[PDB]
Write a protein that binds this ligand. Structure first.
Ligand code: HEM
Ligand code: HEM
Ligand SMILES: [Cl-]
Ligand SMILES: [Cl-]
Ligand code: NA
Ligand code: NA
Lengths: 713, 713
């Protein structure tokens, strides 16, 4: 069945922007998961989960009679695909039940876990999402086994198809580094945006880097991948040691016994995979990773035994029954229970990556401190578990239910509570008037509010104009944001704000976050007036200003646009074509193809480009809101050619005279090239489309201004 | 970027069902093209098109100063992708402007043609679709050159992305037959559903079969492909001779001078392709097919010169300047004009496929009669041209504007006008009650109305319950429709109809078409009552009954379901897995994945299966409308295995006892296997889903019942 991707493997793909359509979703368009969850009896759900922990099913018998370990692993996997580079992955969409993640090798036998949860899912229906239920089950596993969690928030709505995520270019599961599609180069540098060391792993290889069992070099991978999932050294030790306080690994026999992963299994397997020909294929004979390690003397109860063993023994390299590298305690007694036979006992064992916690110098200091102060280990693990499983939930305003922690955490990019009356319609008209009277230009106003709001990404719901972080480090210094021009606009808006607030009664005031956005609104209204159209742009007050102390500068760095097609900005040279980067950014901002088209064509004529570039400014009335970009781009009287100096810059010249009309980038011209985008441009470039263009522009502007406004949701 | 299709190349693909989403469409959700077109000043458009025919642009100079021939070709290609086997292709969605068609080799330089229409598209905007404008332009070309067309209908709404159509398996453009992906086997049998002899051709190879210039054997390909586009011998001769009365072919120099097709061209090409390094690249130097043939002495005017030349000379084989095989009349004077140089003249030339019209014995009789009676040729061509360009438009109710022909054609599957008052709500309630009192069962009622309505296909908008053709040849004898049970139901409904109509005042009466649907509604209402729920299924009267004499039996054959997963029916054994055939049928019925899932799971428990098979009937309350299919399918207490007797049939047995519970096909079990479909089945299989299942089932039942009701559009 030959397809367009077969004939034209390099053409830009837009299907990423029209995922998650009302067509694939079985719930009605009016369904509101937050409202459903809010009515769920969460206490009842958690009782059913407690009971489940020790209700062993014969098709996948519980180790030590308790599923807790397996379910902690399931939840750590649901959350462990997260990358800070784009915010993609993580537990917030329940993607573990779809391709490819349901069939990654590191998710082997988590299909069993998920199926054990079907009876609970089915009982509570739509009032609890799979996404939420995977995390809750992990919380309950912890609690059942004696560990007090820091809290839980509901709110993760299910999704109904796979997201398109770049997980790497390897065409072989688990391919070691240095192949034709290597994710590494240089001195072990992992390519952005990836956060795992091999295709189909969560973070690192439990045997060591590319299979080499060197705990010290494994530490290097752990530190790098975990940092790419937003965890520092303390959170990393806490999570790994916390986790491997419970349960066991499975490697009872050779991996050759294990058959097809779920997406490749026969129809009769009914959604499950990795069927094993080894003995019973399950339970005592289970094969999952190929390792056979049980870390503690009480695998079903919280203890301080992980660090006791790690430091209390010396370790010797050995092989599991499947032939994988692992470690065993020199000269120890057989103190570790067997998962199924009360008459067997085993010596303590560890993974290469567990030993990293001791043989990496920096990890050893932390591990020793946890060993000596197990109350500090327990509290760090509670906190890092909450972070791990909530990191892609977005602002606290999205957190649902009775178990949400009250403590405000730096990682949540907290926004202060609004404690005062908000500006009303009259006040917003008075402020827009003062903004326009100050001398600020349409280009300034629009570029500034674009820079504040366009940081949002819906993958992890970080970013946006709430907070007024544009005035803080590091956003105020980003090159894309034009730090000197920014500084002048913000000075002028800050004087307007001060004077407005100074004149109020009753403690009414306006935040600088709201003013930035309202000012961008004024500039759009002025641009419409410039073109002879009376337009009013919507505006919703209620944003608040975050402090510098509420704004982790290092964590903010991943939000820096290094490509923003909407401002014709490319920070340097990338292997990925600029148009590909545009569609990616559109995806992050949650825009469809039509919204991306309208919004770029308007921004162009409004003077939102970085550095005042003329690239793509296809109008002779800059700062007037018109459909000029589309009419001129599509004019076959103009002929386009890449420049001698730079193949990624084009000159449009009159076809008869030869005279230079315009210049453009690939971002600009792709709208006149790609057959779907050009179809869209043609709608906006038609003679009956001036009003439609303005209206669709103002709608997508307002959508972008409100992307992080979950306080209004 | 490695994707799910790379890892699992054989998994079922659902993305075909969620094409044409509101996300990709730039028009408002309320936009109604029929309304827009109805206010178009069509006469003004056609005046601008007229002018265009002789206004040459320097970037694509008009041959003989007249674009007409190019535009006829453009419109023939727009319409010529149509296959009767599935109704896919055709001009009705303007798909020529999207991949792959915009870049097929047979569409070379039609990108020029489309671009020459942009100024007119732009001028009239949304009130004329590209789809419409391609056909209209070809009409106006014909008219400008003295040919009287049969009519024109507007109403082809634009689409905004490529359809997914199976165009064959070859991975090489224009690959000759007999390769590793050959579309032929046996004695020259072309695989269904294909209707072209090589990948990226419209119908046949102009040089002869696989390039062998034998007119007689070329005739065999023409007749086979044209039949697969719904054209008989008479319509084929007329269309080929008709078309080649105008214009010329382009082969001024070697093919190697021609560059990348549009989808592969650089961004600077701005959507155009086949840039040529041969001399000026255009005009007198144009290279399109590589042939260099001009058929008539007046390439810009209708005439009967095609057959005068074809019969008036003897032909000899020669090569064009690009090396392609074609024919020349050596004994002729140089009577044919040159397209650019008034001082040059050329001998008559023909394609091998033109000579087929003379050397195939059956074609020669028709061609001779056209030759001797060119008024009959003009009429046959006007009629076949209208058919060619309207064949996928659907019911005459969809035809818009002032030029629609009044003559009703057999090929349109015509529906008689309704001349009497319709039944109202009370009447429909009285008829539902009579149907249910007759003894007809929920299974009979639902099966019959499903069989009538489910012939519809949105690809060409043929089929559906309007017309009551289920009672006529050939539908009444299709195996899927269970001819003997059908006959009994229709007898009983016909007695109900007679008695109702006999009792009326004022000429009110009910069609058998309407009654079949209303009866299916009553069966669904009773099934819901059987399950303890009172519902009203919506119902819209207005269908009419067509006669046998208004029903082309041979053309109806392509609508026979040979696979209908919604009735667990497979007429014989196919290479394509049954689940794939299900999704394809869903696509034809215009269903999303959720609607396909609800619909199938209800139909199973209602007793819709062919032959009363138990396969997938996972309920102990058959004929009650419940969500039992999903609850039982998803019960992990049941284990499934393929049977010894048939690998495509499965037994579900109790996992603990081994007792046989159910049997099912691939069609049934895919909903418990495929990760997206199983997520759907889960929503409908949850404990809070009885109401949702019934409501969503009734909504999709109704959707199906109304698929051909463009009279209510
Ligand atoms: C360096 C990071 C990590 C490595 C390389 C790693 C490796 C593994 C492997 C290979 C298994 C065995 C799978 C099997 O054969 O069944 C396992 C099990 C598990 N891991 Fe980790 N792990 C890491 C971090 C984590 C973290 C952050 C957590 C939780 C906070 C976690 C909790 C668990 C649990 C609970 C199990 C046991 C499952 C059961 O009892 O079936 N691990 N780990
Ligand atoms: C056996 C069926 C057919 C074959 C193999 C065929 C083949 C071709 C080829 C090879 C060209 C030259 C393309 C180029 O180099 O520019 C062409 C031109 C054309 N064909 Fe056909 N054709 C077929 C049927 C039709 C039909 C049904 C129509 C319309 C009713 C049509 C109308 C035209 C016209 C108008 C041109 C001239 C283009 C121009 O002047 O620029 N043909 N045909
Ligand atoms: Cl994702
Ligand atoms: Cl199609
Ligand atoms: Na994410
Ligand atoms: Na079609």
């Amino acid at each position: 069945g030959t397809s367009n991707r077969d004939w034209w493997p390099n053409q830009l793909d837009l299907s990423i922007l029209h995922r998650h359509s009302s067509l694939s979703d079985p719930m009605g368009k009016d369904f509101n998961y937050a409202q459903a969850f809010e009515k769920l009896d969460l206490a009842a759900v958690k009782r059913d989960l407690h009971a489940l922990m020790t209700t062993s099913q014969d098709w996948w018998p519980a180790d030590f009679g308790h599923y807790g370990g397996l379910f902690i692993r399931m939840a750590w996997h649901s959350a462990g695909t997260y990358r800070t580079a784009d915010g993609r992955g993580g537990a917030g969409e329940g993607q573990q039940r779809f391709a490819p993640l349901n069939s990654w090798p590191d998710n082997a036998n988590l299909d069993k876990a998920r199926r054990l949860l079907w009876p609970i899912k089915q009982k509570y229906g739509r009032a609890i999402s799979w996404a939420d239920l995977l995390i809750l089950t992990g919380n309950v596993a912890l609690e059942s086994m004696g560990f007090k969690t820091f809290g839980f928030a509901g709110g993760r709505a299910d999704t109904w198809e796979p997201e398109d995520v770049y997980w790497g270019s390897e065409k072989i599961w688990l391919e070691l580094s240095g192949g034709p599609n290597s994710r590494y180069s240089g001195d072990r540098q992992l390519e952005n945006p990836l956060a795992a060391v091999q295709m189909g792993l969560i973070y690192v290889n439990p045997e060591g880097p590319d299979g080499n069992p060197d705990p010290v070099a494994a530490a290097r991978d752990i530190r790098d991948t975990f940092a790419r999932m937003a965890m520092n050294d303390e959170e990393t030790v806490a999570l790994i040691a916390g986790g491997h306080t419970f349960g066991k690994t499975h490697g009872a026999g050779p991996a050759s016994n294990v058959g097809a992963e779920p997406e490749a299994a026969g129809i009769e397997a009914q959604g499950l995979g990795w069927k094993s020909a080894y003995r019973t294929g399950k339970g005592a004979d289970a094969i999952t990773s190929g390792l056979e390690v049980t870390w503690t003397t009480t695998p079903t109860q919280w203890s301080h035994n992980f660090f006791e063993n790690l430091f209390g023994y010396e370790w010797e390299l050995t092989k599991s029954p499947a032939g994988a590298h692992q470690w065993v305690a020199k000269g120890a007694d057989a103190v570790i229970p067997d998962a199924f036979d009360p008459s067997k006992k085993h010596r303590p064992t560890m993974l290469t990556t567990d030993l990293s916690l001791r043989f990496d110098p920096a990890y050893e200091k932390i591990s020793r401190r946890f060993h000596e102060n197990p109350e500090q280990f327990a509290d760090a693990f509670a906190r890092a578990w909450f972070k791990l499983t909530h990191r892609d939930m977005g602002p606290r305003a999205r957190y649902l239910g009775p178990e949400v922690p009250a403590e405000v955490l730096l990682w949540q990019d907290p926004i202060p509570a609004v404690d005062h009356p908000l500006i009303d319609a009259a006040d917003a008209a008075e402020l827009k008037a003062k903004v326009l009277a100050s001398g600020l230009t349409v280009s300034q106003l629009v570029s500034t509010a674009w820079a504040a709001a366009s940081t949002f990404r819906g993958s992890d719901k970080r970013g946006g104009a709430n907070g007024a972080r544009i005035r803080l480090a590091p956003q105020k210094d980003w090159e894309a944001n034009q730090p000197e021009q920014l500084a002048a606009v913000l000075e002028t808006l800050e004087a307007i704000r001060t004077a407005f607030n100074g004149a109020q009664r009753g403690g009414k005031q306006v935040s600088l976050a709201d003013l930035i956005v309202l000012a961008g609104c004024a500039g759009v209204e002025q641009a419409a007036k410039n073109a002879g159209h009376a337009v009013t742009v919507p505006f919703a007050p209620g944003r608040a200003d975050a402090s510098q102390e509420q704004t982790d500068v290092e964590s903010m760095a991943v939000l820096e646009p290094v490509a923003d097609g909407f401002r014709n900005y490319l920070k340097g040279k990338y292997r990925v074509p600029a148009e590909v980067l545009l569609v990616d950014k559109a995806q992050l901002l949650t825009l469809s193809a039509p919204e991306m088209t309208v919004l770029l064509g308007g921004l162009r004529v409004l003077g939102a480009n970085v550095g005042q570039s003329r690239h793509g400014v296809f109008t002779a009335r800059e700062q007037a809101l018109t459909n000029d970009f589309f009419v001129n781009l599509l004019d076959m009287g103009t002929e386009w050619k890449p420049t001698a100096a730079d193949a990624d810059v084009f000159e449009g010249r009159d076809r008869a005279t030869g005279e230079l009309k315009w210049t453009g980038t690939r971002v600009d011209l792709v709208f006149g090239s790609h057959s779907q985008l050009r179809a869209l441009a043609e709608v906006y470039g038609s003679a009956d489309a001036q009003e439609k263009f303005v209206r669709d522009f103002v709608a997508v502007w307002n959508k972008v201004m409100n992307l992080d406004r979950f306080d209004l949701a």
